[PDB]
Design an enzyme around this catalytic site. Sequence first.
Site, short mmCIF file in Angstrom:
data_model
loop_
_atom_site.label_atom_id
_atom_site.label_comp_id
_atom_site.label_asym_id
_atom_site.label_seq_id
_atom_site.Cartn_x
_atom_site.Cartn_y
_atom_site.Cartn_z
N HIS A 35 12.59 6.91 3.17
CA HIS A 35 12.82 5.50 3.45
C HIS A 35 14.28 5.38 3.34
CE1 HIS A 35 12.95 6.25 -1.02
NE2 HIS A 35 13.77 5.38 -1.02
N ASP A 57 7.14 11.03 1.72
CA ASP A 57 8.63 10.29 1.84
C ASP A 57 9.72 11.52 1.98
OD1 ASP A 57 10.57 8.43 1.41
OD2 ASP A 57 9.90 7.84 -0.68
N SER A 109 18.10 7.40 -5.07
CA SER A 109 17.30 8.06 -4.43
C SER A 109 17.74 9.44 -3.98
CB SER A 109 16.57 7.47 -3.45
OG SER A 109 15.34 6.45 -3.72
#
Length: 158
Positions: A35, A57, A109
Amino acid sequence: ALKLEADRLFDVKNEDGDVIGHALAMEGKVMKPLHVKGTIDHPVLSKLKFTKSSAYDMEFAQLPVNMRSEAFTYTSEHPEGFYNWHHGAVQYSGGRFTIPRGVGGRGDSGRPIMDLSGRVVAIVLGGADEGTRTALSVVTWNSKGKTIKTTPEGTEEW
């Protein structure tokens, strides 16, 4: 004690160059949350051919023979208790990794959660605030090497 460590954590930047996530050298690969759309700030790593894994992901490439040594080691055993990460302590209980509310956000992230012996236990993707804490959406592997993804209700990708 001087924190001299190899090069394993890399920044992923957006079009104008804002750090929007992180990439890591671990178990022979360079991985980063799918992402996170930006470039890995690294002259060698940014030119590699990355393989997508939408179900988890994740996005990964094989570590150049050289850097293969400069990397983290994973571990599938996480007894409850406390862990470490960039911002401090990460708690593990009830199958969930939590941090205090208002600490996680954009830029977090791809960041790993580690144990005292310095092994990676998980990689952060996002978080869902619940009361006084935030439940993390992380990627972890089991004893048989299977990738696993846990995402709380209302998780917001960081």
